[PDB]
Amino acid sequence: KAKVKATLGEFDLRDYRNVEVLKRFLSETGKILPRRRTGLSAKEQRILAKTIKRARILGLLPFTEKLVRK
Amino acid sequence: MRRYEVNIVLNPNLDQSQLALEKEIIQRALENYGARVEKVEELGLRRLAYPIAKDPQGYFLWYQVEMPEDRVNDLARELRIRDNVRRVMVVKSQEPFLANA
Amino acid sequence: PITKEEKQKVIQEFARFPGDTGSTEVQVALLTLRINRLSEHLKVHKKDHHSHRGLLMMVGQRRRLLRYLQREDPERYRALIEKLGIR
Amino acid sequence: KRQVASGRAYIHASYNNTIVTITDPDGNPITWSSGGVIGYKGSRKGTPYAAQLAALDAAKKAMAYGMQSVDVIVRGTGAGREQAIRALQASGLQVKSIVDDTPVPHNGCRPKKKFR
RNA sequence: GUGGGAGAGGGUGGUGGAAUUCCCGGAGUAGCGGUGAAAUGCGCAGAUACCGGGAGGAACGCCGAUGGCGAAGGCAGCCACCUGGUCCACCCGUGACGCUGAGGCGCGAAAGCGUGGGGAGCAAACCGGAUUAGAUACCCGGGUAGUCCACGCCCUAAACGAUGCGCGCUAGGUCUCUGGGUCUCCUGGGGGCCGAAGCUAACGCGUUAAGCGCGCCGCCUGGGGAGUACGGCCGCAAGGC
Ligand SMILES: [Mg+2]
Ligand SMILES: [Mg+2]
Ligand SMILES: [Mg+2]
Ligand SMILES: [Mg+2]
Ligand SMILES: [Mg+2]
Ligand SMILES: [Mg+2]
Ligand SMILES: [Mg+2]
Ligand SMILES: [Mg+2]
Ligand SMILES: [Mg+2]
Ligand SMILES: [Mg+2]
Ligand SMILES: [Mg+2]
Ligand SMILES: [Mg+2]
Ligand SMILES: [Mg+2]
Ligand SMILES: [Mg+2]
Ligand SMILES: [Mg+2]
Ligand SMILES: [Mg+2]
Ligand SMILES: [Mg+2]
Ligand SMILES: [Mg+2]
Ligand SMILES: [Mg+2]
Ligand SMILES: [Mg+2]
Ligand SMILES: [Mg+2]
Ligand SMILES: [Mg+2]
Ligand SMILES: [Mg+2]
Ligand SMILES: [Mg+2]
């Protein structure tokens, strides 16, 4: 179980229309992931949520998705 | 005046003429609610996570404007109107806070 | 709401000499502008009480201040009521 | 008598029963069974066993439509979810996937007191 | 003043996806639901289970926290405006302008009230099914006010940290939110846990005091009778003080 902020390129959490970075922060379903498996700090994960929701509204990012295998 | 990012996502299946019509009306009303455009980007037809209007794709543009604050809401409401507009969002613009920190 | 522009036009209006930022008339003036925006924000939006708490805070403070003027200098209080149009 | 090629199967598993509805790749049903469908009546409707037999009679009825391989949607948390899976995959119907669509809301609907 | 913050602090206007219900069509067949076991109930006028579509209300999953905000009550999808409080930096301005606060005034979970809307889920009362000796209940199936919105009243609470506000002094350690700093560390502001001294009836409290002091308000004086009676005041009422 790797760490999904902890290897990636430096960026803007306030950029709501950038998928390729953001969708990395989601899950095997559509859920925004815990600081545990991201590694963003306090302030970080706040802004992250807020923009991820911004994108979800804007259509780019999922509200949900289904677990595969089982 | 204040600085805002205008996101307009519209109906993908507009051919050029239609598309420039909606593109235009966006612009004329934009100009008529007093909103000067500091910048624009048309990133075009991007695909969607969930269907909007059962349409897996939508057509995106963006306008950074300086406009009188009182009217921002109203202006949104005008761009809203069009049937070919799918989604509208005004952001108040932001200095870009930084990541992996 | 209020911008440095406006703020400053007032500061420099009521600065009791050049470079006065925090004097009594000044403080009261800043206060009065705050108060008037708020009051009128409350002329609609009666329904938001919290901000009205704020209104109270402010009217009080400017009233203490002002009293202190009336005490210290009847003259500055006299004409800062001329200007600021209150009490 | 439709000659249905390959397809997809829905396991709906509650606490109180287990139902399997199998449909074409398009979403429209073909055959279905539950524990109530086979013999069982009262609480025994939700046995893991009664579930295996639901999924089993469902795969049989389906097998005779020329159903071949399914994509199995799972919805619900019940006992008898597992026997529903193993029943299918081990019916000789071969399993093309299994999923979880199991819908949970973004908190809109106050539930019955039994559920607070 | 200036510069820099963080936040479910408030109002209004928009608005987004998930789920429930219902209607519409599709395909599909005997059950579904529910329990401790079961019945009531719904089902061949084709339900349950799956797909498509529409309607409408309500609330906001994951982020969410042992977190944050606010004086309290309380505040959680996203946008915009309108606004309150607040923290650190610089040491720029006034020059004690300060603290507390009887009265008065304002706020004030829920329930409840009046008028007018709204009503998807829930659900007192009710209507049934169980269960028991009985069951005016716990369980099951329905359902009305209500829950929602506006305006107006009500003004209660385990309104709990059961701990009034302000300021000063008295070892630390650790986790933490948020600032500033020549950035294992230092330095302010919040929130937690262990603890020096000291306090305590003990339990515990301990730089977020229940320690050492000062100001100022509220308050108590055996239990029941009783938050009752009478009086007054408030309220449409219920009732409140
Ligand atoms: Mg439109
Ligand atoms: Mg049963
Ligand atoms: Mg139908
Ligand atoms: Mg019947
Ligand atoms: Mg509370
Ligand atoms: Mg503010
Ligand atoms: Mg100085
Ligand atoms: Mg001097
Ligand atoms: Mg006071
Ligand atoms: Mg109240
Ligand atoms: Mg209420
Ligand atoms: Mg009412
Ligand atoms: Mg009514
Ligand atoms: Mg009931
Ligand atoms: Mg009900
Ligand atoms: Mg009534
Ligand atoms: Mg108190
Ligand atoms: Mg630092
Ligand atoms: Mg501290
Ligand atoms: Mg302790
Ligand atoms: Mg000791
Ligand atoms: Mg006595
Ligand atoms: Mg009386
Ligand atoms: Mg009367």
XYZ file of C-alpha atoms (C1' of nucleotides) and ligand atoms in Angstrom:
639
model
C 0.000 0.000 0.000
C 1.919 3.033 -1.409
C 1.370 6.714 -0.746
C -0.555 8.664 -3.389
C 0.469 12.257 -2.686
C 3.912 11.057 -1.710
C 4.987 10.350 -5.296
C 3.615 12.809 -7.833
C 4.615 16.173 -9.314
C 4.254 19.486 -7.452
C 1.034 21.258 -8.267
C -1.993 23.463 -7.686
C -4.778 22.134 -5.576
C -6.790 25.170 -6.453
C -6.958 24.132 -10.119
C -10.381 22.600 -10.494
C -10.317 21.862 -14.185
C -7.129 19.755 -14.127
C -8.149 16.137 -14.096
C -5.039 14.196 -14.683
C -3.624 15.258 -11.391
C -6.845 15.286 -9.329
C -8.393 11.975 -10.276
C -5.288 10.401 -8.820
C -6.629 11.512 -5.431
C -9.854 9.577 -5.780
C -10.385 5.907 -5.213
C -11.172 2.462 -6.654
C -14.615 4.055 -6.275
C -15.494 7.736 -6.648
C -14.560 8.714 -3.057
C -12.050 11.359 -1.971
C -9.298 9.529 -0.159
C -8.194 9.920 3.522
C -5.034 11.959 4.321
C -3.715 8.506 5.197
C -3.513 7.309 1.614
C -2.880 10.801 0.215
C -0.516 12.536 2.565
C -1.722 16.035 2.055
C -1.743 18.049 5.247
C -4.637 19.796 6.935
C -4.870 22.920 4.773
C -3.978 20.804 1.839
C -6.769 18.243 2.101
C -9.270 21.043 2.663
C -8.432 22.823 -0.568
C -8.245 19.470 -2.234
C -11.789 18.578 -1.228
C -13.097 21.921 -2.253
C -11.668 21.767 -5.749
C -12.470 18.068 -6.246
C -16.085 18.889 -5.533
C -15.695 21.835 -7.981
C -14.629 19.341 -10.671
C -17.317 16.840 -9.806
C -19.848 19.567 -10.418
C -17.992 20.537 -13.573
C -18.355 16.944 -14.874
C -14.769 15.859 -15.026
C -14.656 13.894 -11.822
C -16.983 11.168 -10.476
C -19.448 11.429 -7.680
C -19.258 7.704 -7.295
C -17.987 4.574 -8.958
C -18.342 0.804 -8.485
C -15.798 -1.527 -6.842
C -14.428 -4.095 -9.338
C -13.652 -7.826 -8.686
C -15.434 -8.731 -5.325
C -14.742 45.348 -10.586
C -13.304 41.987 -9.376
C -11.719 39.022 -11.157
C -13.673 35.853 -11.959
C -13.254 32.679 -14.024
C -16.376 32.035 -16.177
C -16.797 28.373 -17.010
C -19.265 27.595 -19.689
C -19.858 23.939 -20.675
C -22.149 23.444 -23.593
C -23.951 20.935 -25.787
C -21.273 18.958 -27.646
C -23.183 18.341 -30.898
C -23.378 21.959 -32.048
C -21.911 22.164 -35.545
C -19.796 25.218 -36.154
C -22.551 27.799 -36.972
C -24.702 26.900 -33.950
C -21.599 26.820 -31.872
C -20.484 30.208 -32.794
C -23.988 31.469 -32.151
C -24.012 30.285 -28.548
C -20.339 31.338 -28.282
C -21.401 34.780 -29.422
C -24.461 35.269 -27.225
C -22.263 34.248 -24.308
C -20.024 37.037 -25.381
C -22.532 39.872 -26.126
C -24.359 39.431 -22.827
C -20.985 39.071 -21.109
C -20.149 42.461 -22.520
C -23.606 43.756 -21.631
C -23.501 42.997 -17.925
C -20.346 45.076 -17.988
C -17.781 42.298 -17.961
C -14.498 42.931 -19.724
C -12.527 39.851 -20.684
C -8.951 39.700 -19.486
C -8.409 36.267 -21.118
C -10.177 33.246 -22.627
C -9.529 29.537 -23.426
C -11.611 27.169 -25.580
C -10.474 23.679 -24.631
C -13.295 22.235 -26.583
C -14.989 18.915 -26.321
C -13.843 17.094 -23.207
C -15.294 13.809 -22.053
C -17.428 13.441 -18.849
C -17.269 11.245 -15.742
C -21.085 11.111 -15.529
C -23.406 11.959 -18.447
C -24.705 15.502 -18.689
C -27.958 15.430 -20.673
C -27.106 11.698 -21.230
C -24.152 13.025 -23.254
C -20.814 11.476 -22.304
C -18.974 14.612 -23.671
C -19.382 18.435 -23.323
C -17.722 21.535 -24.822
C -15.742 23.774 -22.481
C -14.665 27.400 -22.458
C -13.307 29.741 -19.883
C -13.234 33.513 -19.479
C -11.149 35.392 -16.933
C -13.013 38.685 -16.518
C -12.999 41.925 -14.562
C -16.628 42.732 -13.887
C -18.772 44.750 -11.460
C -19.527 42.394 -8.552
C -23.154 43.334 -8.178
C -23.933 41.758 -11.530
C -21.922 38.525 -11.351
C -24.950 36.483 -10.225
C -27.224 38.088 -12.773
C -24.671 37.445 -15.552
C -24.453 33.809 -14.575
C -28.291 33.781 -14.754
C -28.218 35.035 -18.354
C -25.631 32.488 -19.573
C -27.763 30.003 -17.759
C -30.705 30.633 -19.956
C -29.643 29.099 -23.208
C -30.851 25.573 -23.902
C -27.536 24.720 -25.465
C -25.638 25.682 -22.336
C -25.265 22.557 -20.145
C -23.318 23.765 -17.091
C -22.257 27.313 -15.898
C -19.832 28.207 -13.062
C -18.362 31.538 -12.021
C -15.397 31.355 -9.649
C -13.913 34.363 -7.970
C -10.368 34.030 -9.320
C -7.613 32.615 -7.098
C -3.836 33.047 -6.592
C -2.768 29.407 -6.979
C -1.992 27.515 -3.706
C 0.707 24.779 -3.926
C 0.932 21.021 -3.528
C 2.898 18.048 -2.153
C 3.556 20.265 0.912
C -17.994 46.160 1.193
C -15.317 48.699 2.161
C -12.053 49.244 0.178
C -8.724 50.842 1.159
C -9.636 53.549 -1.293
C -12.729 54.586 0.615
C -11.133 53.891 3.961
C -8.236 56.137 3.161
C -10.354 58.952 1.718
C -11.872 59.040 5.192
C -8.729 58.551 7.238
C -7.148 61.466 5.465
C -10.385 63.388 5.762
C -10.440 63.109 9.570
C -6.750 62.607 10.340
C -6.237 65.386 12.877
C -2.928 66.061 11.128
C -1.128 64.389 8.283
C -0.184 60.780 9.048
C -2.768 60.330 11.785
C -3.986 56.765 11.357
C -5.426 55.786 14.754
C -6.599 59.027 16.514
C -10.002 59.529 18.090
C -11.877 61.311 15.296
C -10.281 58.952 12.856
C -11.234 55.870 14.879
C -14.745 57.136 15.222
C -14.940 57.859 11.518
C -13.753 54.457 10.404
C -16.308 53.183 12.890
C -19.135 55.239 11.495
C -18.506 53.995 7.973
C -18.392 50.361 9.188
C -21.603 50.984 11.077
C -23.412 52.508 8.112
C -22.597 49.760 5.697
C -23.653 47.298 8.372
C -26.796 49.145 9.308
C -27.888 49.242 5.666
C -26.903 45.625 5.242
C -29.393 45.194 8.013
C -31.998 47.377 6.394
C -32.385 44.280 4.275
C -31.278 40.987 5.782
C -33.009 41.721 9.066
C -32.936 37.932 9.292
C -29.174 37.729 9.982
C -28.804 38.463 13.637
C -25.195 37.625 14.167
C -23.952 40.406 12.095
C -26.306 42.665 14.057
C -24.423 41.578 17.231
C -21.568 43.034 15.391
C -23.564 46.222 14.904
C -23.999 46.445 18.638
C -20.334 45.934 19.330
C -19.536 48.753 17.044
C -22.138 51.285 18.094
C -21.084 50.790 21.659
C -17.388 51.223 20.905
C -17.913 54.385 18.943
C -20.159 55.629 21.788
C -17.502 55.037 24.446
C -14.923 56.663 22.268
C -17.170 59.562 21.585
C -17.966 59.967 25.256
C -14.246 60.119 25.923
C -14.040 62.881 23.424
C -16.924 64.809 25.019
C -14.971 64.495 28.222
C -11.467 65.359 26.967
C -12.375 68.011 24.393
C -15.854 69.418 24.054
C -14.605 71.085 20.861
C -13.454 68.071 18.901
C -16.652 66.268 19.969
C -18.713 69.359 18.978
C -17.447 69.550 15.414
C -16.886 65.801 14.885
C -20.606 65.618 15.430
C -20.940 68.507 12.949
C -19.047 66.426 10.381
C -20.133 62.950 11.316
C -23.782 63.877 11.745
C -24.889 61.803 14.800
C -25.917 61.636 18.548
C -37.646 -18.786 -25.825
C -35.125 -16.031 -26.789
C -31.579 -17.428 -27.479
C -29.829 -14.882 -25.317
C -26.074 -15.354 -25.985
C -23.831 -14.010 -23.155
C -25.016 -11.597 -20.412
C -25.206 -10.190 -16.847
C -26.593 -11.268 -13.435
C -27.839 -9.266 -10.462
C -27.558 -10.596 -6.898
C -29.800 -8.646 -4.540
C -28.995 -9.711 -0.984
C -30.806 -8.406 2.021
C -30.976 -9.799 5.508
C -34.291 -11.390 4.966
C -34.157 -13.224 1.638
C -31.916 -13.498 -1.388
C -32.978 -12.740 -4.979
C -31.176 -13.296 -8.260
C -32.351 -11.688 -11.464
C -30.408 -12.419 -14.645
C -30.633 -10.193 -17.691
C -29.199 -9.560 -21.171
C -26.179 -7.296 -21.682
C -28.759 -4.484 -22.226
C -30.322 -4.398 -18.725
C -33.697 -6.121 -19.370
C -34.434 -9.285 -17.348
C -34.629 -12.860 -18.528
C -34.907 -15.173 -15.512
C -35.061 -14.895 -11.744
C -35.350 -16.818 -8.532
C -35.327 -16.217 -4.808
C -35.440 -18.355 -1.746
C -39.194 -17.844 -1.775
C -39.195 -19.181 -5.346
C -37.692 -22.506 -4.373
C -39.413 -24.284 -1.477
C -38.507 -22.160 1.546
C -41.009 -19.875 3.252
C -40.317 -18.109 6.597
C -36.927 -16.922 7.881
C -35.314 -19.783 6.032
C -35.852 -17.637 2.918
C -32.629 -15.789 3.764
C -30.384 -18.714 4.489
C -27.030 -18.809 2.746
C -28.288 -22.245 1.592
C -31.600 -21.041 0.295
C -29.527 -18.365 -1.459
C -27.215 -20.874 -3.172
C -30.321 -22.646 -4.484
C -31.881 -19.397 -5.703
C -28.770 -18.523 -7.672
C -28.656 -22.128 -8.741
C -32.179 -22.495 -10.098
C -31.676 -19.071 -11.678
C -28.523 -20.189 -13.526
C -30.301 -23.351 -14.650
C -33.439 -21.639 -15.991
C -31.037 -19.205 -17.609
C -28.695 -21.944 -18.975
C -31.613 -23.164 -21.018
C -31.938 -19.761 -22.617
C -28.482 -20.154 -24.088
C -27.036 -17.891 -21.457
C -23.293 -18.536 -21.340
C -21.261 -16.067 -19.293
C -22.366 -13.308 -16.946
C -21.175 -10.087 -15.417
C -22.447 -10.335 -11.837
C -23.633 -7.163 -10.151
C -23.758 -7.356 -6.357
C -26.060 -5.211 -4.320
C -26.895 -5.498 -0.668
C -25.287 -6.757 2.486
C -26.791 -10.079 3.503
C -25.809 -13.551 4.549
C -26.282 -15.565 1.412
C -24.351 -13.126 -0.736
C -21.430 -15.511 -0.767
C -23.410 -18.614 -1.539
C -25.009 -16.619 -4.335
C -21.666 -15.886 -5.833
C -20.293 -19.398 -5.427
C -23.569 -20.775 -6.762
C -23.242 -18.724 -9.939
C -19.533 -19.011 -10.674
C -19.772 -22.734 -9.909
C -22.916 -23.256 -11.956
C -20.798 -23.686 -15.072
C -22.180 -20.443 -16.087
C -18.772 -18.801 -16.198
C -18.398 -15.447 -14.438
C -17.123 -12.519 -16.499
C -16.783 -10.247 -13.530
C -18.471 -9.566 -10.205
C -19.209 -5.988 -9.147
C -20.440 -3.828 -6.328
C -23.154 -1.313 -7.302
C -24.535 -1.495 -3.799
C -26.270 1.828 -3.557
C -25.837 3.990 -0.610
C -27.140 7.567 -0.510
C -25.360 10.894 0.006
C -27.646 11.302 3.044
C -31.007 12.452 1.885
C -33.634 10.252 3.376
C -34.456 9.892 7.048
C -34.781 6.207 7.720
C -37.263 4.177 9.789
C -36.391 4.118 13.516
C -35.343 0.498 13.130
C -32.511 2.038 11.122
C -31.217 5.069 13.084
C -3.355 52.039 10.564
C -0.930 48.740 7.819
C 0.273 43.849 5.831
C -0.774 38.605 6.024
C -4.097 34.483 7.555
C -7.720 30.236 8.657
C -12.880 28.743 9.442
C -19.791 24.006 8.468
C -19.674 32.312 12.062
C -24.301 34.722 9.975
C -28.304 36.488 5.576
C -30.038 36.234 0.333
C -29.977 34.488 -4.530
C -28.632 30.537 -7.499
C -27.421 25.563 -7.970
C -25.099 20.019 -8.203
C -24.879 14.649 -7.884
C -26.509 10.006 -4.567
C -30.776 7.805 -2.526
C -36.197 7.120 -1.245
C -41.184 7.643 -3.026
C -44.417 8.150 -7.036
C -45.901 8.338 -12.349
C -44.412 6.871 -17.365
C -42.669 2.984 -20.725
C -39.523 -1.349 -21.309
C -38.308 -6.490 -20.342
C -39.971 -10.425 -16.786
C -43.021 -14.235 -13.398
C -44.782 -15.764 -8.617
C -44.097 -14.264 -5.002
C -42.380 -9.896 -2.165
C -42.066 -7.860 2.668
C -41.442 -8.729 7.674
C -40.005 -11.702 12.573
C -37.654 -14.409 17.807
C -41.326 -17.361 15.052
C -45.097 -15.185 12.360
C -49.429 -12.615 10.920
C -51.357 -7.968 9.138
C -49.765 -5.852 4.288
C -48.596 -5.658 -1.052
C -48.990 -9.364 -5.650
C -51.317 -12.420 -11.865
C -55.590 -4.965 -12.843
C -48.296 -8.821 -13.233
C -45.582 -7.046 -7.345
C -40.667 -7.973 -5.777
C -35.530 -8.134 -8.651
C -33.057 -5.175 -13.680
C -32.760 -1.030 -17.531
C -34.692 3.642 -19.649
C -37.431 8.166 -18.779
C -40.070 11.840 -15.894
C -41.825 14.265 -11.400
C -40.995 16.171 -6.363
C -39.382 16.772 -1.589
C -35.928 16.447 1.776
C -31.319 16.017 3.503
C -25.861 16.487 2.130
C -21.925 10.279 1.345
C -16.374 9.985 0.786
C -13.342 14.651 2.374
C -14.352 14.321 8.542
C -11.217 14.331 12.366
C -9.520 12.455 18.592
C -10.779 18.662 13.453
C -12.903 24.149 12.773
C -16.382 28.450 13.684
C -19.658 31.275 16.924
C -21.485 34.604 23.000
C -24.769 30.978 23.619
C -28.675 28.189 21.091
C -26.085 26.309 17.415
C -23.428 26.032 12.234
C -21.361 20.679 7.168
C -22.326 19.252 -1.251
C -20.611 23.616 -4.778
C -21.027 29.283 -6.626
C -21.854 34.574 -6.042
C -22.947 38.565 -3.544
C -24.090 40.978 1.408
C -21.767 40.811 6.090
C -19.999 39.434 11.975
C -16.117 37.785 14.861
C -10.969 36.493 15.025
C -5.368 35.176 14.892
C -0.130 36.305 13.868
C 3.498 40.213 11.592
C 5.241 45.447 11.514
C 5.739 48.926 16.154
C 2.979 53.404 12.350
C -1.457 56.222 14.923
C -4.520 58.007 19.440
C -3.132 58.416 24.897
C -6.133 54.735 30.207
C -9.916 55.926 26.060
C -10.146 50.649 30.762
C -13.165 45.847 33.756
C -17.855 44.302 35.214
C -22.832 45.149 34.743
C -29.006 45.756 38.485
C -32.603 47.270 35.318
C -33.935 47.763 29.897
C -33.058 45.640 25.020
C -31.576 41.691 21.579
C -30.665 36.634 20.575
C -32.323 31.866 21.977
C -32.193 23.113 20.287
C -36.721 20.766 19.915
C -41.614 20.695 20.828
C -45.777 23.800 20.492
C -49.081 28.497 18.263
C -51.578 31.767 14.100
C -51.963 32.693 8.781
C -50.344 31.285 4.061
C -47.613 27.728 0.994
C -45.238 22.785 0.735
C -45.322 17.625 1.593
C -40.521 12.551 -0.833
C -38.835 9.883 3.817
C -40.057 9.824 8.667
C -43.839 9.822 12.158
C -47.053 11.494 18.218
C -52.455 10.571 17.837
C -54.577 7.058 15.468
C -55.727 2.099 12.377
C -54.418 -2.828 12.122
C -50.815 -7.494 12.876
C -48.134 -10.094 16.659
C -46.783 -10.938 21.989
C -48.204 -11.706 26.867
C -52.175 -13.339 32.400
C -53.308 -8.479 30.231
C -49.815 -5.349 26.432
C -53.899 0.828 25.975
C -45.725 -1.278 25.274
C -41.306 -3.010 23.569
C -41.453 -6.187 17.619
C -44.299 -6.027 12.606
C -47.740 -3.330 8.634
C -50.174 1.424 7.669
C -50.763 6.751 8.972
C -52.308 12.470 10.915
C -50.450 16.733 12.900
C -45.653 17.601 12.553
C -41.127 17.485 10.466
C -39.969 21.625 5.257
C -40.633 27.430 3.521
C -42.352 32.549 4.656
C -44.096 36.083 8.136
C -45.575 36.412 13.238
C -45.690 34.495 18.392
C -43.761 30.958 22.069
C -38.732 31.833 25.366
C -38.281 26.232 27.640
C -33.886 22.327 28.421
C -29.047 17.406 31.625
C -29.662 25.650 27.352
C -23.656 20.636 30.723
C -17.398 21.938 31.211
C -23.649 20.820 35.334
C -17.460 25.071 36.287
C -19.895 33.985 35.172
C -16.588 37.632 32.777
C -11.821 40.390 32.926
C -6.673 40.909 34.322
C -1.785 39.325 37.021
C 1.645 35.442 39.041
C 2.709 29.623 39.633
C 7.357 23.041 36.752
C 7.038 20.420 32.633
C 5.901 16.875 29.026
C 3.213 15.007 24.779
C -0.654 14.997 20.513
C -2.832 19.046 17.756
C -5.493 23.312 14.519
C -3.786 27.911 12.774
C -0.225 32.256 12.049
C 5.002 34.577 12.200
C 10.454 32.907 12.625
C 18.220 33.137 10.881
C 12.688 26.264 10.477
C 14.907 18.526 15.216
C 13.887 23.994 16.935
C 11.948 29.019 18.461
C 7.620 32.339 19.112
C 1.882 33.966 19.471
C -3.354 32.305 19.208
C -7.114 27.901 19.695
C -8.238 22.765 20.884
C -6.806 17.605 23.931
C -3.987 14.180 27.172
C -0.448 13.256 31.297
C 1.554 15.781 35.250
C 5.536 20.516 39.569
C 3.738 23.425 43.387
C -0.674 24.023 45.190
C -5.974 22.856 45.843
C -9.776 19.057 47.132
C -14.723 15.774 51.290
C -12.908 12.616 48.146
C -13.330 11.901 42.973
C -10.578 14.922 40.752
C -8.524 20.196 39.162
C -3.654 21.743 37.817
C -0.737 27.984 32.592
C -7.881 25.841 28.686
C -7.250 25.701 37.511
C -11.209 23.426 40.660
C -3.830 26.847 42.225
C -2.090 32.120 44.211
C -4.692 37.085 44.120
C -7.970 41.612 42.602
C -12.568 43.879 40.415
C -17.589 43.305 39.183
C -22.310 40.518 38.380
C -25.646 36.012 39.324
C -26.653 32.785 43.049
C -27.249 29.120 47.845
C -28.798 28.551 53.562
C -31.935 20.663 55.816
C -35.706 17.041 52.983
C -40.980 16.707 51.558
C -45.055 19.997 50.801
C -43.558 22.886 45.596
C -41.491 25.143 41.252
C -47.409 24.081 44.087
C -50.769 28.256 46.237
C -52.207 33.429 46.222
C -50.719 38.188 43.864
C -48.528 40.615 39.832
C -46.566 40.505 34.820
C -46.094 38.182 29.882
C -48.761 35.096 26.288
C -53.824 33.751 21.080
C -53.185 29.420 23.429
C -50.348 25.786 25.605
C -47.871 28.009 29.302
C -43.648 31.270 30.965
C -41.487 34.496 34.944
Mg -29.794 25.615 -20.063
Mg -38.232 -14.814 5.642
Mg -43.384 -1.079 -14.665
Mg -54.414 -10.750 -2.385
Mg -24.271 21.116 21.935
Mg -14.636 38.002 7.236
Mg 4.532 53.623 19.223
Mg 2.392 61.229 21.743
Mg -20.307 43.708 29.123
Mg -36.636 29.340 20.474
Mg -38.754 24.162 16.176
Mg -46.904 25.363 11.811
Mg -50.207 24.627 8.009
Mg -44.094 1.835 13.558
Mg -44.297 4.399 7.554
Mg -53.324 21.677 13.138
Mg -22.653 29.375 31.467
Mg 6.595 27.447 10.043
Mg -1.291 26.291 24.053
Mg -4.702 16.089 34.870
Mg 1.161 16.852 44.183
Mg -38.833 23.067 56.733
Mg -50.927 33.037 38.402
Mg -54.384 37.954 29.031
